[PDB]
């Protein structure tokens, strides 16, 4: 596959809402398919990545080695950029953290409807 | 005419969000049929048991044979003759003596 596939365009950035500068640090990956009937190399990568259970949240760094590994298993995973509206959680708030489906990890859970 | 469904058959439906907006309140007072839209009791001045006996009339050869009797029974209830036929002792004994009944 040509490298142009992984070279983004200005329109692509708008569609996916990703800024070319300050790229997202952490990837959110969940397995949505089975590795049965797949070649051994595909099976090995999934086990190494820890995505044994489907729909299992995993925190991984957006680094070339992880990026290379994720590309191999791209079709079996969903990639979402992590967002920290309130910043990194503190030690005291480590028990109050909650990750939303939108990709935002709130450090304080107030048990109030967003509405 | 705020209600989106007709209120004339079952009950008047009054839909209203609460002031806080946390609750949806439905008020459903029942509606009675108008007097003008009802029929009077039969003015002319017989028990259903008598009618049932009359329907299964005994006319030919005094009591009719089993087949005609089943056919007469089948016609009244719009059922098949197969339903009326009895069953053997084996299954009859198997029937539960004390079936449970709730509500």
């Amino acid at each position: 596959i040509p490298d142009k596939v992984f070279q983004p365009k200005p329109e692509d950035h708008e569609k996916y809402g990703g800024d070319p500068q300050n790229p997202h640090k952490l990837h959110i990956v969940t397995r949505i398919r089975s590795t049965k009937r797949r070649p051994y190399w595909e099976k090995d990568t999934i086990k190494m990545l820890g995505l044994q259970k489907a729909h299992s949240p995993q925190i991984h760094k957006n680094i070339p080695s992880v990026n290379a590994k994720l590309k191999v298993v791209k079709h079996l995973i969903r990639i979402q950029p992590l967002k920290l509206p309130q910043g990194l959680p503190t030690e005291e708030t480590m028990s109050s953290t909650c990750l939303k489906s939108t990709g935002e990890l709130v450090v304080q859970w107030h048990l109030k409807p967003v509405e | 005419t705020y209600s989106s469904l007709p209120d004339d058959y079952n009950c008047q439906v009054d839909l209203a969000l609460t002031a806080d907006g946390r609750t949806i309140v439905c008020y459903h007072p029942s509606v009675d049929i108008p007097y003008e839209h009802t029929k009077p009791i039969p003015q002319p001045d017989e028990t259903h048991e008598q009618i049932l006996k009359a329907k299964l009339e005994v006319r030919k050869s005094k009591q009719l044979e089993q087949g005609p009797m089943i056919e007469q029974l089948s016609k009244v209830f719009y059922t098949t003759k197969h339903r009326w036929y009895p069953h053997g002792q084996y299954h009859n004994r198997r029937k539960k003596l004390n079936p449970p009944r709730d509500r």
Binding site: - | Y2, D14, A16, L17, A19, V25, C26, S30
Partner: protein
């Protein structure tokens, strides 16, 4: 006929018919008027039997006076002790009902029930399919159980 005029026909208009919703300002007045009557109804206690829908464990239980509910698990609560269910989404009255979004406020509705018995489940047979099944490859399931009796359902005019 004016420019770009299309008379209504079978294919000019969709099978469905467009409707116009009522204006909001007057509609909001209708909302308050119904609420005011309802608050008086709750205050006047013009209701008898009530039914409430309560979500417990992974199940939703419609509840009424004298109802008996069986929970297929232990609760750790002694028998004869009254307990309050905290998750109620709907409560019904003779001529009116309240619907949570998705739950009502705790102040409006309070529901209490009592634990009657702690029990287990009658044996359940489990047998996996395999060649040469044999008769001794059998397992029984006697998972725990508990019994609850509904005691009271309470509402107040706190609209």
């Amino acid at each position: 006929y004016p420019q770009g005029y299309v008379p209504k026909t079978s294919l000019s208009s969709p099978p469905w018919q467009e409707v116009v919703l009522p204006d909001p300002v007057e509609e909001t007045r209708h909302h308050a008027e119904v609420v005011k009557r309802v608050n008086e109804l709750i205050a006047t206690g013009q209701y008898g039997r009530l039914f409430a829908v309560v979500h417990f464990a992974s199940h939703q239980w419609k509840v009424t006076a004298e109802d008996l509910i069986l929970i297929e698990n232990e609760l750790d609560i002694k028998c004869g002790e009254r307990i309050r269910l905290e998750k109620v989404l709907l409560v019904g009255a003779d001529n009116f009902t309240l619907l949570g979004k998705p739950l009502l406020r705790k102040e409006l509705v309070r529901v209490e029930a009592t634990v009657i018995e702690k029990t287990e489940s009658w044996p359940k047979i489990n047998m996996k399919f395999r060649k040469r099944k044999n008769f001794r490859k059998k397992k029984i399931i006697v998972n725990p159980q508990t019994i609850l009796r509904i005691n009271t359902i309470e509402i107040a005019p706190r609209l």
